[PDB]
Write a protein that binds this ligand. Structure first.
Ligand code: HEM
Ligand SMILES: COCCCCCCCCCCCC(=O)O
Ligand SMILES: *[C@@H]1O[C@H](CO)[C@@H](O)[C@H](O)[C@H]1NC(C)=O
Ligand SMILES: *[C@@H]1O[C@H](CO)[C@@H](O)[C@H](O)[C@H]1NC(C)=O
Ligand SMILES: *[C@@H]1O[C@H](CO)[C@@H](O)[C@H](O)[C@H]1NC(C)=O
Ligand SMILES: *[C@@H]1O[C@H](CO)[C@@H](O)[C@H](O)[C@H]1NC(C)=O
Ligand SMILES: *[C@@H]1O[C@H](CO)[C@@H](O)[C@H](O)[C@H]1NC(C)=O
Ligand SMILES: [Cl-]
Ligand SMILES: [Mg+2]
Length: 325
């Protein structure tokens, strides 16, 4: 279906309401590395089994959290192109599942949001790097480090100052312990944006002060659960304030080269100075590598989803056509 449009009414409102109660997981229910999508599934804004269409995901992030339209479209279609089933139009917000339908041929993985190196990546705040065995479950030790950074830099609350310090700490921990640490292109951009999301979207919209308390933080990050009487943000937003996070500790994109403490800058990677290059490489390299010679029905589904992806790209970039027009 077409990408949904922006909210007709984007006011703050109760989103933890009678029609969207929190429910525990049933056997087979899928939760993944994103506490935003996990919470919408656990409140019934998304299907509770954690398998959804792109249009369902865009509608849920807007209705439940007031995520802005352009960001919703870009992230949803990027995730769907690399992790979703383009024929059935279904994406798992977590582990690979037969529930997304019959698979395309390799090398396409349709691995859900849990698939390492497509969307999900290293130096997550409350999830471990895939090298350590689990890139998707809430990690109590990592969350306690988020609390400690909130106590030291946020007076007990998570804010953009905390995000700047913790983002850099998680990069330095990955450099020191993960010999396969990768921090380039798509992951380089999304890792910085994700650290603003709690301050911009998990803060009750009646305050919208960018100060997230640790009870609310645990409720979202561990339990996929809105605080009692949670109001969504009072206007559409996503990564507002990412400039503060970067400015705290500016980093070049790069990777460890098979050893710890070997972080090597990648001059071929995009960075914040080349945002159009990030889009071009995502399409010409990442998507194309998963579908190099697609059959007629797959080509048509790719071209449709790539057009939808381009709707979320900031004005100024040129659309690229890996399968022709
Ligand atoms: C619009 C579609 C969305 C998609 C496809 C999506 C997908 C993802 C994925 C795959 C990750 C894991 C990346 C990683 O850390 O390795 C992630 C992280 C995250 N997402 Fe989402 N996301 C979306 C929207 C949102 C929204 C609306 C929120 C908040 C309301 C949110 C909050 C977060 C946070 C806080 C993290 C970082 C988790 C951590 O580092 O511990 N996301 N997202
Ligand atoms: C800096 O964090 C990035 C997280 C993305 C959140 C806002 C997505 C907005 C989509 C425009 C992207 C333009 C482009 O890709 O060239
Ligand atoms: C929009 O929704 C809010 C809160 O749900 C409501 O109070 C407000 O009156 C609505 N605006 C319009 C134009 O209906
Ligand atoms: C190691 O890094 C490569 C890309 O550089 C990635 O494709 C692979 O999945 C990574 N594996 C783990 C578990 O970190
Ligand atoms: C959580 O993260 C810590 C710190 O990286 C790690 O040592 C531990 O094995 C991870 N997993 C669990 C289940 O705690
Ligand atoms: C984070 O909280 C601390 C302590 O209240 C404060 O000094 C800092 O200005 C806050 N940062 C932001 C961006 O709100
Ligand atoms: C992407 O491919 C198009 C041709 O299809 C080309 O114009 C563009 O330069 C490519 N960009 C990159 C970064 O490879
Ligand atoms: Cl919007
Ligand atoms: Mg990760």
């Amino acid at each position: 279906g077409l990408p949904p449009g922006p909210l007709e009414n984007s006011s703050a409102k109760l989103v933890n309401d009678e029609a969207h109660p929190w429910k525990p997981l049933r056997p087979g229910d899928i939760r993944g590395p994103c506490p935003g999508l996990n919470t919408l599934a656990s409140h019934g804004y998304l299907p509770r089994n954690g398998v959804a269409t792109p249009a369902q995901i865009i509608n849920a992030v807007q209705e439940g959290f007031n995520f802005d339209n352009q960001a919703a479209i870009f992230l949803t279609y990027a995730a769907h192109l690399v992790d979703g089933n383009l024929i059935t139009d279904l994406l798992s917000i977590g582990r690979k599942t037969r529930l997304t339908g019959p698979d395309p041929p390799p090398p396409a993985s349709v691995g859900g949001l849990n698939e390492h190196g497509t969307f999900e990546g290293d130096a997550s705040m409350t999830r471990g790097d895939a090298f350590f065995g689990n890139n998707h479950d809430f990690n109590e030790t990592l969350f306690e480090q988020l609390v400690d950074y909130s106590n030291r830099f946020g007076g007990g609350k998570y804010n953009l100052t905390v995000a700047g310090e913790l983002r850099f700490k998680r990069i330095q921990d990955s450099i020191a312990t993960n010999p396969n640490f990768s921090f380039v292109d798509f992951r380089f951009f999304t890792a910085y944006g994700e650290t603003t999301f709690p301050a911009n979207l998990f803060v009750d919209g009646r305050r919208d002060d960018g100060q997230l308390d640790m009870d609310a933080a645990r409720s979202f990050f561990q339990f996929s659960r809105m605080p009692d009487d949670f109001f969504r943000a009072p206007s559409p937003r996503s990564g507002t304030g990412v400039e503060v996070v970067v400015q705290a500790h500016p980093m070049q994109p790069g990777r460890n080269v098979g050893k710890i403490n070997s972080y090597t800058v990648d001059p071929t990677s995009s960075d914040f100075s080349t945002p159009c290059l990030m889009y071009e490489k995502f399409v010409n390299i990442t998507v194309k590598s998963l579908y190099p010679n697609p059959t007629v029905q797959l080509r048509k589904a790719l071209n449709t989803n790539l057009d939808f992806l381009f709707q979320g790209v900031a004005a100024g970039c040129t659309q690229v056509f890996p399968y022709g027009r």
